[PDB]
Amino acid sequence: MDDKELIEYFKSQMKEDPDMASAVAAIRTLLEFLKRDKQGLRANLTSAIETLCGVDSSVAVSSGGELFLRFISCKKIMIERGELFLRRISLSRNKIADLCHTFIKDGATILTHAYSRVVLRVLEAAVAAKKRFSVYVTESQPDLSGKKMAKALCHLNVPVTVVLDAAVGYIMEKADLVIVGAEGVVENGGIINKIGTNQMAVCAKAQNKPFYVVAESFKFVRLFPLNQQDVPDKFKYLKEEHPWVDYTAPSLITLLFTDLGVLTPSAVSDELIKLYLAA
Amino acid sequence: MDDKELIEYFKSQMKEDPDMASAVAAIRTLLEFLKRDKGETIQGLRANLTSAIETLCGVDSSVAVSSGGELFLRFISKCKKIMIERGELFLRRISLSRNKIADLCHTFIKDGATILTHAYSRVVLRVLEAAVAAKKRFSVYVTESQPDLSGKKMAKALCHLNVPVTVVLDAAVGYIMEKADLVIVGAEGVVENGGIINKIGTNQMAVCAKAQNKPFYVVAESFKFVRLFPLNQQDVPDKFKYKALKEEHPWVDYTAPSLITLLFTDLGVLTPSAVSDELIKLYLAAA
Amino acid sequence: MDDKELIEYFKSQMKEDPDMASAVAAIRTLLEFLKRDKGEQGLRANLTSAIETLCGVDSSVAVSSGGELFLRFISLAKCKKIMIERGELFLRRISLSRNKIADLCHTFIKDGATILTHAYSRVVLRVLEAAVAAKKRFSVYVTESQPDLSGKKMAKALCHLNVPVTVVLDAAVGYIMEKADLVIVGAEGVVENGGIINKIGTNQMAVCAKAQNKPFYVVAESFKFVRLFPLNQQDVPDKFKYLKEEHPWVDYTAPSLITLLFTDLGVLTPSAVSDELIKLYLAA
Amino acid sequence: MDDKELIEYFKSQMKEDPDMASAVAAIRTLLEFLKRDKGIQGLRANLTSAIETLCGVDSSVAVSSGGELFLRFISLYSKCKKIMIERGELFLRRISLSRNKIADLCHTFIKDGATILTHAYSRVVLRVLEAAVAAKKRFSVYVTESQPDLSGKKMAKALCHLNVPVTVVLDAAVGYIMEKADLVIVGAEGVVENGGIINKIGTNQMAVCAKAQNKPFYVVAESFKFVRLFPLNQQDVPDKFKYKADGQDLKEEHPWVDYTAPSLITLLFTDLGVLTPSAVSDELIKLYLAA
Numbered sequence A: 001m002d003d004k005e006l007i008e009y010f011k012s013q014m015k016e017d018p019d020m021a022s023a024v025a026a027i028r029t030l031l032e033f034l035k036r037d038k039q040g041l042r043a044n045l046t047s048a049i050e051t052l053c054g055v056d057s058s059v060a061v062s063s064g065g066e067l068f069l070r071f072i073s074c075k076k077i078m079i080e081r082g083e084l085f086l087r088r089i090s091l092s093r094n095k096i097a098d099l100c101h102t103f104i105k106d107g108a109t110i111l112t113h114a115y116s117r118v119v120l121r122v123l124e125a126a127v128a129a130k131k132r133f134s135v136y137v138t139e140s141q142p143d144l145s146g147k148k149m150a151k152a153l154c155h156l157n158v159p160v161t162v163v164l165d166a167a168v169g170y171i172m173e174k175a176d177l178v179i180v181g182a183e184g185v186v187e188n189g190g191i192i193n194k195i196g197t198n199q200m201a202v203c204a205k206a207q208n209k210p211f212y213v214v215a216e217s218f219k220f221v222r223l224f225p226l227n228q229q230d231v232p233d234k235f236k237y238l239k240e241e242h243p244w245v246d247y248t249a250p251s252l253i254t255l256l257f258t259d260l261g262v263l264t265p266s267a268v269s270d271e272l273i274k275l276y277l278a279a
Numbered sequence B: 001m002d003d004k005e006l007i008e009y010f011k012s013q014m015k016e017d018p019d020m021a022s023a024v025a026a027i028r029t030l031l032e033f034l035k036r037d038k039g040e041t042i043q044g045l046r047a048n049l050t051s052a053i054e055t056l057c058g059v060d061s062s063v064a065v066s067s068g069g070e071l072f073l074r075f076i077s078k079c080k081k082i083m084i085e086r087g088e089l090f091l092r093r094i095s096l097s098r099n100k101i102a103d104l105c106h107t108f109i110k111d112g113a114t115i116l117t118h119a120y121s122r123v124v125l126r127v128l129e130a131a132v133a134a135k136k137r138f139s140v141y142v143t144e145s146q147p148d149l150s151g152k153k154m155a156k157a158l159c160h161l162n163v164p165v166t167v168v169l170d171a172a173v174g175y176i177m178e179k180a181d182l183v184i185v186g187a188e189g190v191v192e193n194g195g196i197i198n199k200i201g202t203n204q205m206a207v208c209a210k211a212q213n214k215p216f217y218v219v220a221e222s223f224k225f226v227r228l229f230p231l232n233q234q235d236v237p238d239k240f241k242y243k244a245l246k247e248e249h250p251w252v253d254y255t256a257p258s259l260i261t262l263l264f265t266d267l268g269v270l271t272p273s274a275v276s277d278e279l280i281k282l283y284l285a286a287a
Numbered sequence C: 001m002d003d004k005e006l007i008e009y010f011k012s013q014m015k016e017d018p019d020m021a022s023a024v025a026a027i028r029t030l031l032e033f034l035k036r037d038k039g040e041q042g043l044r045a046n047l048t049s050a051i052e053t054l055c056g057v058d059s060s061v062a063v064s065s066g067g068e069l070f071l072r073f074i075s076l077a078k079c080k081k082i083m084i085e086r087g088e089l090f091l092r093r094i095s096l097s098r099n100k101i102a103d104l105c106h107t108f109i110k111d112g113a114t115i116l117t118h119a120y121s122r123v124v125l126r127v128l129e130a131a132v133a134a135k136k137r138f139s140v141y142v143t144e145s146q147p148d149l150s151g152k153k154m155a156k157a158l159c160h161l162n163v164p165v166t167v168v169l170d171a172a173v174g175y176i177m178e179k180a181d182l183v184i185v186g187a188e189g190v191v192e193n194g195g196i197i198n199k200i201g202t203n204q205m206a207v208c209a210k211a212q213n214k215p216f217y218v219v220a221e222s223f224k225f226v227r228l229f230p231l232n233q234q235d236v237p238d239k240f241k242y243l244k245e246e247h248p249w250v251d252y253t254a255p256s257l258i259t260l261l262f263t264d265l266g267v268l269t270p271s272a273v274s275d276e277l278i279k280l281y282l283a284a
Numbered sequence D: 001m002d003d004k005e006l007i008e009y010f011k012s013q014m015k016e017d018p019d020m021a022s023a024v025a026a027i028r029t030l031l032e033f034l035k036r037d038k039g040i041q042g043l044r045a046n047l048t049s050a051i052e053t054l055c056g057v058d059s060s061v062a063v064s065s066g067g068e069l070f071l072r073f074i075s076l077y078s079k080c081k082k083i084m085i086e087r088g089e090l091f092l093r094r095i096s097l098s099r100n101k102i103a104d105l106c107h108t109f110i111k112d113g114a115t116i117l118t119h120a121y122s123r124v125v126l127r128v129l130e131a132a133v134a135a136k137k138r139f140s141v142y143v144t145e146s147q148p149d150l151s152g153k154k155m156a157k158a159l160c161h162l163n164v165p166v167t168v169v170l171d172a173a174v175g176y177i178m179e180k181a182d183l184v185i186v187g188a189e190g191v192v193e194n195g196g197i198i199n200k201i202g203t204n205q206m207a208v209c210a211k212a213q214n215k216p217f218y219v220v221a222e223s224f225k226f227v228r229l230f231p232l233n234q235q236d237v238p239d240k241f242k243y244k245a246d247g248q249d250l251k252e253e254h255p256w257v258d259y260t261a262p263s264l265i266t267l268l269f270t271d272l273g274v275l276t277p278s279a280v281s282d283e284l285i286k287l288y289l290a291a
């Protein structure tokens, strides 16, 4: 392969299935790349392509890519362990759905932000459990991905209501819990997500509503932010500011439903070590 | 409805369905008895004559029949009463228990895991069903469980879900333990200290799993939470046991909380030590 | 003799005399094999071990350890065929083992004790008799021991001595353990690390006795010391062990689950067996 | 030794040393009774039992829990060789260590400059606060006078004689005063299986008010006070523990103790360690089985 063929197999892998995590698409592309040819001679040939996939700022593409590489270790066994990794990361969503939909009381009113493939999967699991619940979702500027989310939920016949980003503090009082996804989960158990998440978390804590995060383990990223500035620019981009993500501290999170299990923010560091040192 | 009717009604509830739990069949019978108790009159006597029947049903040594029965009468605080509204709301909820537990627990059965269980358990059965429905691949070892051999019945039920299963002697438990990844067991009752009262042979299976670091999981409904705190076997009421050249034949033994890893309930996953807080909330439900 | 006779002789040793250990019954048929066998040389040494395996009819571990020990200590030498006199010697010595043991044990069974046992054991019966008839009052608990219910058989034997005895289900060992003072058990075989192979169910009884701090004592003859070094159930040879069903006749109990072993060689803690075993196998 | 003797020996022990836990005074006289008892083994048993209950003439849960635990730990020609007395003294030697272990564990949680609120008189809380002055910590106390025996006042002097600032307040001013406190430290007459506690009437009220203002509620108590009860409400505390203790119009209400559920308690400081209410059931099993 090469640059032309990478930014392809990848970019279209996502077209054939827009339900697929940005990260999985990429890992899928690498695994494909290893299925190319003519030792460490190739090991550098790969690293040179994750950066290439820097054609998508996603924290996940970065961290998942790193994890995929670390999992690998003539070069057959590498295309094997890599397949055993892909097959594994694509089981995360079912796991997160099983684990989390259980925390949704029947008759609950849930508040979410923007669009999340995993959250959606969680709510589907809940209807499949015969749970009756309502949903409020932010419209989420500037791409209005919350309206997208509302549409998807409407098709699963879930009563959903779209409110303005500015109305979270206002609507909070009538919600029982908050469930949002993540772009990445940092070392301290906090999360990086679509701009607006932080405010929702702050507002939920003020009224004592549990704040749940659902995200795959491959989004575990090696960063320890102390505030909004410690979040690398590459992941978020005196008259106008436009960050796509913001950071939400562990103190503002109740639990994180991950494929590694249900976790408190502080328990994340232990899991993140076991994850990166897998084998 | 009189005593004759009750015992008949209760027995035909399980009749029309062997897969029903004893406490649920018993709770439904209190609901009918309640309904068919217009002959009564004072809101007090309904609640009073209703206690008289629990005992009648007590003709089922089962622990759950007591706790389910007690919990039922509790969830219910003139001649015209809305108690029945609560009694049906109560029935409506304990009927979701077994299933909440199955989709709560199956997620924890890893692929290729070998599971060890004891005798026959309706809850454990629903759990495994959810696991094959989840497309998971596992195998099972189950004690034949003397003296009624319910383990063999359990095994056949599993065989009909196409789950690979092997029946082994109650004595082969410590032997087979090394080839199991985890242990899943049901319960006749969940005690205040997070421990459990179950079919004889459970205690030693737990001790054995403990010595090999094998996780030990209990899956049980909340109506099985009972107001007892035993320190050893002797502390278990005979009403539930049937015991302590002679012979002894206790039908149940006691498993301490130090021997249980997690309990999977309709109230969520619990560690043994957290059972006491949930039992409180559960018994003071009405408030 | 010939295969036929061999087995027929063996089976008719324990049948008319169950009192006798399989191992001992095996060397007896072996003395006769040898005796009744005339006309050789190495032929003898080979035809004799090539039929000792035949006595495998008894998947019993003792037949194997016994046969070897017996064979090893008579081979030291048709005048050389006076191995027979060593065989009578050996068979004469091993027939004192039960007794040295029942003696090394009268001290540990204290007046008023409650003993928990598993299945049937001739050596255990002996020890308790040498204790009761020896002015001691105790009561016993024994597992019925599926599948041949040999536990009930043991019970009856204990009743005949008017010792109070209660039979419980194998499933009730962890239930009855709190009311036991100690457990005494026999062994089909003592392995090189001080552990033991015994009737299925023995293992879990030891694990429970240990969690409740109850001393676990094994009572067995030195001719049961076998050359095997298992670390788990999987290491025990199938040859001794025998919708699916698994029916292992015996299981292994690691040495850390054993307090003391009483043998004709003296009372031993599990970590002493290995050295004894060798100091035993290597005897002139 | 007959009943009159027991009682006098028991009250002497308490007059001898007023800082001695009531339960400690009790097992001591049980030990003395066991030493004199000139009566077979079975006798000795119900004898050292049909007196422990006689000591029950101090309707305190502790005296009951202590005795029970003592008989348990002590229990097991043969006659005389009773190694019971030896075990007895050993048990006695360990429980007398407890109070200090609590002092050490707890004072660590008293932030310098903190205002602590207490209820009635508690010997262990007194020891905890001494362990605090010793650690060079500066704090101030607020304590309820505690009707009807006004034991809170006596607590205030003890503290005054230790030089710690202390203010006495009416039992009715706890909700009012809560505002000024940083935390609540109260003792216990008994710790029940669910982690809750039985203590001087007025305790529950303080814990409920503490929780409402998110003030940490700490309990300091020796493990011989772990009792086998699982109360669900006030009516569940046996009457022998709340009455005779220390027409139309009725003062018919003079309970000496009340119950404080596990959800109103933050931490229990024990010789067995710093435990959260849920962890109590496992320690109570270990305590009662250890033997």
Ligand SMILES: [Cl-]
Residues within 6 Å of the ligand: A019, A093
């Ligand atoms: Cl998906």
